[PDB]
Design a binder for these strands. Structure first.
Ligand code: 0KX
Ligand code: MG
Ligand code: MG
Ligand code: NA
Ligand code: NA
Length: 326
DNA sequence: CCCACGGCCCATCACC
DNA sequence: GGTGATGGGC
DNA sequence: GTGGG
């Protein structure tokens, strides 16, 4: 974090544009510039120096010049003093409350943590849980604990069926010493791009994790994606662990590599790799990589036998998980 | 100067 | 109930 | 907010 001051500012600007302005491309623009600056190995001495990087234009250069001279940004000082912006920004930190619901709550006078707790009935299920574990969801997860959770999930899934393969992805797979949540990619031989030869493959895994009281809540649940809450078990007299967010994604087994590429991330790395794919004449999702015709309609899935194959198609030298933290 | 900005699962809602 | 848009999120 | 064509 040579330029922590700058990337903090841009991130705060990104969050403002997303939550308050509801201008999602300004949000992406700021997080993009913040990302490319974060890996810049020198201590930026000027906005013009920053402008040389792809993603940093004139406006951000100006803001960097102001920040380096005064240590702060007036655009942000103002935003920080607005009640509406502060209320809306706070509300969006509750899982299940997006920019729209946040602004709508404020119109009704519901703008504090106490307001949410007294008005539980005006929340849907996701928001109710997000409020419930608002404190825990602010806490990060030490890799030490991620290791415990990994072993539990993997052993529980082995117990359901020895042919399930569960892989922890996300920031954990990228080698982070701390994670915001747990991300699990799941495969089973019965579920391929060809056919689902067995119903409820994800349900049974969730069921099992619920019966050992690992999974405690459910935010959403379909045939391929689980979004919910989990908690490590504690020993006698030992104070309980915080509740953690957990994401489980069931992917067709023959499409494991695109799946594990996708959910390893990061989100910004994924954005960059797929944009580059489009430039190179391909399109990548969590299932396949396809060519673009002169048309703009995708062709057939190209053969993929590894993560490196995907990198190869678009003329990218392979980058290990720990070098994908953009 | 113009425009597109990665790709998609689940919950909810509007409409027929 | 089917379909499609929208919100929130990965 | 930024940048390729
Ligand atoms: N916008 C997004 C968000 C997530 N993802 C994929 C890549 C992420 O690594 C993976 C999990 O999302 P995530 O849990 O919100 N972020 P991630 O695990 O990378 O970092 P953490 O904050 O969880 O530690 O989903 C994506 O492709 N596009
Ligand atoms: Mg994660
Ligand atoms: Mg996640
Ligand atoms: Na630039
Ligand atoms: Na939220």
């Amino acid at each position: 974090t040579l330029n922590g001051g700058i990337t903090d500012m841009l991130t705060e600007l990104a969050n403002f544009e997303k939550n308050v302005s509801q201008a999602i491309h300004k949000y992406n623009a700021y997080r993009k510039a913040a990302s490319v600056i974060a890996k810049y190995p020198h201590k930026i001495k000027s906005g013009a120096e920053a402008k040389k990087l792809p993603g940093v234009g004139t406006k951000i250069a100006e803001k960097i010049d102001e920040f380096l001279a005064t240590g702060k940004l007036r655009k942000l000082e103002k935003i920080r003093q607005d009640d509406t912006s502060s209320s809306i920004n706070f509300l969006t930190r509750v899982s299940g409350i997006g920019p729209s619901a946040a602004r709508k709550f404020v119109d009704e006078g519901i703008k504090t943590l106490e307001d949410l707790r007294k008005n539980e009935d005006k929340l849907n299920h996701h928001q109710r849980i997000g409020l419930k574990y608002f404190g825990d969801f602010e806490k990060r997860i030490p890799r030490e604990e991620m290791l415990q959770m990994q072993d539990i999930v993997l052993n529980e899934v082995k117990k359901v069926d020895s042919e399930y393969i569960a892989t922890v992805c996300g920031s954990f797979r990228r080698g982070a010493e701390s994670s915001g949540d747990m991300d699990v990619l799941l495969t089973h031989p019965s579920f391929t791009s060809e056919s689902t030869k067995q119903p409820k493959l994800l349900h049974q895994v969730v069921e099992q994790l619920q019966k050992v009281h690992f999974i405690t809540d459910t935010l959403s649940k379909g045939e391929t994606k689980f979004m919910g809450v989990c908690q490590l078990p504690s020993k006698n007299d030992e104070k309980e662990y915080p509740h953690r967010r957990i994401d489980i994604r069931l992917i067709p087994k023959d499409q494991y590599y695109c799946g594990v590429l996708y959910f390893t991330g990061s989100d910004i790395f994924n954005k960059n790799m797929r944009a580059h794919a489009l430039e190179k004449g391909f399109t990548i999702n969590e299932y396949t990589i396809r060519p673009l015709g002169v048309t703009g309609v995708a062709g057939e899935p190209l053969p993929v036998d590894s993560e490196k194959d995907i990198f190869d198609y678009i003329q990218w030298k392979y980058r290990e998980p720990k070098d994908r933290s953009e």
